[PDB]
Ligand binder design. Structure first.
Ligand SMILES: OC[C@H]1O[C@@H](O[C@H]2[C@@H](OC[C@H]3O[C@@H](O[C@H]4[C@H](O)[C@@H](O)[C@H](O)O[C@@H]4CO)[C@H](O)[C@@H](O)[C@@H]3O[C@@H]3O[C@H](CO[C@H]4OC[C@@H](O)[C@H](O)[C@H]4O)[C@@H](O[C@@H]4O[C@H](CO)[C@@H](O)[C@H](O)[C@H]4O)[C@H](O)[C@H]3O)OC[C@@H](O)[C@@H]2O)[C@H](O)[C@@H](O)[C@H]1O
Ligand SMILES: [Cl-]
Length: 372
């Protein structure tokens, strides 16, 4: 008993406003937005250049055409390290954001994120016991505090747990079980609440490879799976060339270069996306388990100039359209990764300072990709 029980006021099970199964819940969602670099930012909510989440932002997200938000959250840095007690002020701040998103009729998914790495980088036997205890303490607290929200609120137990092999996968399964058990033991609406569980590294391939069973649940048909998508790295996030490969500036049929052809994709084009998303359709969607596509986006390269810029941006725009559209086609619910930035190598499509659209052309792609 490393930490005290934070399961202090467990309520009676309450199905009020928790009527939708995972699958029904998932039919209500077709486009999602991440509040990236915000509630997970190390040093505080405003420490990574974004301002505090405001109702105005959430209204803009719903106005702009999204159905749900994913709110990565940091926790470890706000908790007493001897007792694993999380600051009541932080807890009230998270509740406040959840309440506002739901006031804007958004679905909401709250996680524990990388969060300084305590769990996410430590899916190993040596850390399993201490991590299991912290996972339980935090989740008891988190779910207790958020217990009364109806089915607009989902929980996701981890972010991108670094499980690379079967041994690490079994540790990750443990972490997911504790997350389920923690949440359910607090009762109330948390007995029926749709929970979201993460594939190893949220990587499609390693999930297909290593995943086995959902954790056991007292609830019935109340679990989703989660993967992320930044394929191919070279286009989506690569910022410099390495010896092993070059950055892709361009992507998609119609938008490849003929002058600088070395910045066209050598891989990770349309068919591959089709193929990976098919792996998850088979493993989960067709077994009646929706898949959250929790993060995707390809960064802007505004350090380009000229014909180069114009081409890049056309390809970037289509990539988001294609991923949005092909994920939906196969039962994956796509959530755009937005780190708030409007500068180079960033992914913000809103201007957080002004509560306005910065990147209409990418917002258009996600929308056309959902609206079709
Ligand atoms: O200090 C934190 C610590 O973080 C460690 O990396 C881990 C951490 O990444 C944060 C980055 O997350 C990106 O999103 C990821 C998402 O969370 C994952 O789920 C997804 O799989 O992968 C995504 C990868 O893309 C997010 O897009 C990144 O922005 C973020 O990086 C942090 O960004 C902030 C904000 O500014 C930058 O982005 C916005 C731009 O407009 C701007 O131009 C950029 O500079 C950075 O803030 C800065 O902090 C430095 C510190 O000195 C100051 O110099 C600067 O003034 C201040 O603005 C921040 O540094 C950067 O970390 O969480 C996800 C995990 O996967 C990563 O491993 C690093 O290893 C540590 O070294 C350390 O930074
Ligand atoms: Cl390809």
């Amino acid at each position: 008993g490393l930490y005290p029980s934070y399961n202090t006021s467990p309520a009676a099970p309450d199905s009020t406003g928790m009527q939708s199964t995972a699958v029904q819940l998932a039919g209500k969602i077709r486009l999602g937005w991440n509040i990236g670099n915000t509630m997970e930012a190390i040093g505080g909510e405003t420490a990574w250049g974004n301002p505090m989440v405001s109702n105005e932002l959430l209204k803009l997200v719903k106005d702009s055409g999204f159905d749900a938000v994913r709110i990565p959250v940091a926790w470890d840095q706000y908790a007493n390290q001897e007792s694993a007690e999380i600051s009541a002020a932080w807890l009230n701040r998270v509740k406040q954001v959840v309440q506002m998103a739901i006031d804007n009729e958004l679905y909401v998914l709250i996680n524990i994120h990388w969060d300084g790495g305590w769990l996410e980088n430590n899916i190993t036997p040596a850390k399993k016991d201490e991590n299991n205890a912290k996972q339980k303490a935090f989740w008891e607290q988190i779910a207790t505090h958020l217990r009364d929200f109806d089915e607009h609120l989902l929980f996701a137990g981890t972010n991108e747990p670094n499980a690379e092999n079967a041994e690490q996968m079994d540790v990750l399964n443990s972490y997911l079980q504790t997350f389920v058990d923690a949440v359910r033991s607090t009762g109330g609406k948390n007995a029926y609440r749709v929970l979201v569980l993460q594939g190893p590294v949220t990587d499609i391939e390693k999930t297909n490879e290593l995943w086995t069973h959902m954790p056991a649940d007292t609830a019935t048909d109340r679990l989703m799976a989660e993967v992320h998508f930044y394929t191919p790295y070279n286009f989506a996030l690569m910022r410099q060339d390495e010896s092993w490969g070059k950055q892709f500036y361009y992507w998609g049929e119609g938008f490849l270069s003929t002058t600088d052809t070395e910045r066209n994709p050598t891989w990770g084009e349309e068919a591959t996306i089709d193929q990976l998303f098919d792996l998850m359709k088979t493993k989960f969607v067709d077994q009646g388990i929706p898949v959250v596509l929790g993060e995707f986006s390809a960064m802007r390269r505004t350090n380009l100039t000229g014909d180069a810029l114009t081409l890049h941006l056309a390809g970037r725009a289509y990539y988001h359209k294609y991923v949005t559209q092909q994920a939906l086609a196969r039962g994956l619910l796509p959530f755009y990764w937005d780190n708030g930035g409007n500068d180079n190598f960033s992914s913000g499509i809103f201007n957080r300072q002004q509560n306005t659209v910065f990147d209409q052309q990418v917002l258009d792609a996600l929308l056309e990709g959902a609206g079709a």
